[PDB]
């Protein structure tokens, strides 16, 4: 819900406890397409798979 | 890698295949003396499976390289 | 009369409708585009009540759509000359009745009505009545008229009864 | 060619079955309870609206079993299915009206077996 | 119970290309991700040739019968 340049990871921690963190997005073509670069905590991340 | 032979990991993991630590062979290859008789010997080879849990020895080692692409993949 | 038919319509899909809701989106479709119409052959679709089966759908050549041949029941509302149905008479006028068969709009003219029947311009509403003021029939009241004609508009049926039989009139 | 009156309708048509209007709105409010349950900001026609209480107001039939016997107990003589529903829609009283209304009626049945049968609907009414 | 070749003839592979990329360009949904190219035709493509594209080709034989196949179902030539 933060933007078009955003997308969140939400992860199960425990059963019934989830965590929600902030991916952040940038360099899109189109509002569909994916950030060229993801970024948590200001770190960067080069695609959802490094994410996971 | 050993029986040269491509198999689709959609029904290895289909057929609750089970993991090795590490991909290091101790393989059978029947070499050519300089006389020209063959005969196989095979000593520590380890191809990069899980990085990181390499040991201090090991980690610059490499003379040939499978990549996947993303540059990630070498972190640390 | 009201009748359960099995129809089948072919629907036109935009490929941007293609995708994991397709299959629902055509039966959404197919809703919106025969319930209320109404054709010469088939009388007014009142209600699709269940969609038989969705065929395969055919990549039209040259254009992006796919068009789905789809078999559905339907309550329709077909009307006969011959019909003998209650009508609600909703507007009387100085030339016949006109008056309502569910959706059908119909009219009986002055002329098709017992000859003891007269306007009566002043009531409260006009009305037609006898000369023994036996039977008046006015708006809101229940006629059981015959169909004697019909005609087919687009997307509509107008039908023209008679109460020249027997048992025919009020309620 | 078609009049009901002698029992003719088109080829497209004679394959169909009819409904009784109690039948139809039982059907039609279904309809229209599914309708308001899975909301989704979709409309409905006038002419179902003036189909459903145009049928409320000749709903001979109420109880959902009512309608399910007068049809069962209409269907063990040898009706054609149109008059199986214009005699529930009608509900004539005495068999000479019956007759009257269908005229495919006359020879069809004697007038106190008929008569029999008007009675019986009639007790079924609500 | 099929008898047809279980092969893509080029005229398959050529009309599956050109419908599923007038699909695409009329924005039905692509069944794979876009690295970011545009031309409908190249996304149609990756399609196929990662075999997700949403098409069943439906064969008529000479007698009047037809079989219809997925096209993850049959082997692509090129």
Same mark, same amino acid.
């Given at each position: 819900?933060?933007?078009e ?5 939400? &992860? ?26 993801? &970024? ?13 | ?11 290895k ?7 090795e ?28 499976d899980?990085?990181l ?24 | ?44 679709? /009142?209600?699709?009540?269940?969609i038989?089966?969705?065929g ?14 789809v078999?559905?029941?339907? /309550? ?29 709009? +119909?009219?009986i ?17 006009? +009305? ?6 036996? /039977? ?15 005609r ?20 | ?9 088109? %080829? ?37 609206? %003036? ?20 049809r069962?107990?209409?269907?063990? %003589? ?35 077996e ?13 | 119970? =099929?008898?047809?070749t ?6 398959e ?37 990662? =075999? ?5 080709? =439906? =064969? ?19």
């Amino acid at each position: 819900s933060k933007g078009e340049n955003h997308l969140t990871v939400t &992860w199960k921690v425990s059963d019934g406890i989830y965590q929600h963190v902030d991916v952040r997005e940038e360099g899109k073509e189109n509002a569909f397409s994916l950030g060229a670069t993801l &970024w948590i905590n200001s770190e960067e991340f080069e695609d959802l798979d490094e994410i996971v | 890698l050993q029986d040269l032979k491509f198999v689709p990991s959609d029904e290895k993991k289909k057929q609750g295949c089970q993991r090795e630590n590490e991909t290091l062979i101790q393989r059978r290859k029947d070499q050519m003396q300089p006389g020209g008789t063959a005969i196989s010997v095979t000593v520590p080879y380890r191809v990069v499976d899980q990085p990181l849990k390499l040991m201090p020895q090991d980690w610059d080692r490499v003379v040939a390289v499978f990549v996947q692409g993303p540059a990630w993949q070498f972190k640390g | 009369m009201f009748y359960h038919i099995s129809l089948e319509h072919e629907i036109l899909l935009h490929p941007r409708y293609f995708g994991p809701n397709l299959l629902n989106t055509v039966k959404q479709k197919l809703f919106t585009e025969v319930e209320g119409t109404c054709t010469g052959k088939y009388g007014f679709v /009142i209600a699709v009540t269940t969609i038989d089966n969705i065929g395969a759908g055919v990549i039209q050549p040259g254009r992006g759509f796919v068009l789905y041949p789809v078999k559905y029941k339907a /309550i329709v509302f077909r009307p006969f000359k011959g019909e003998v149905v209650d009508a609600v008479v909703t507007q009387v006028n100085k030339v016949g009745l006109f008056t309502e068969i569910g959706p059908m709009s +119909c009219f009986i003219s002055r002329h098709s009505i017992p000859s003891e029947m007269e306007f009566d311009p002043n009531s409260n509403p006009p +009305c037609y009545k006898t000369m023994d003021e036996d /039977i008046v029939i006015q708006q809101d009241d229940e006629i059981r008229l015959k169909i004697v004609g019909t005609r087919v508009d687009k997307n509509d049926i107008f039908a023209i009864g008679s109460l020249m039989d027997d048992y025919l009139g009020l309620v | 060619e078609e009049d009901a009156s002698q029992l003719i309708f088109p %080829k497209e048509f004679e394959t169909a079955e009819t409904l009784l209007n109690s039948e139809v709105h039982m059907l039609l409010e279904h309809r229209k309870q599914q309708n308001e349950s899975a909301e989704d900001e979709q409309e409905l026609s006038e002419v179902f609206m %003036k189909t459903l209480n145009y049928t409320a107001r000749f709903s001979r039939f109420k109880n959902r079993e009512t309608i399910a016997s007068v049809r069962s107990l209409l269907l063990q %003589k040898k009706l054609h299915k149109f008059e199986l529903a214009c005699l529930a829609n009608l509900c004539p009283e005495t068999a000479e009206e019956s007759k009257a209304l269908i005229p495919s009626l006359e020879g069809r049945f004697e007038d106190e077996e008929l008569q029999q049968i008007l009675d019986d609907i009639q007790t079924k009414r609500s | 119970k =099929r008898i047809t070749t279980p092969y893509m003839t080029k005229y398959e592979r050529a009309r599956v290309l050109g419908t599923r990329a007038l699909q695409i360009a009329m924005c039905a949904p692509v069944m794979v991700e876009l690295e970011g190219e545009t031309d409908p035709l190249l996304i149609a493509m990756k399609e196929l040739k990662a =075999r997700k594209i949403p098409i069943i080709i =439906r =064969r008529y034989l000479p007698d009047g019968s037809y079989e219809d196949w997925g096209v993850d179902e049959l082997i692509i030539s090129d």
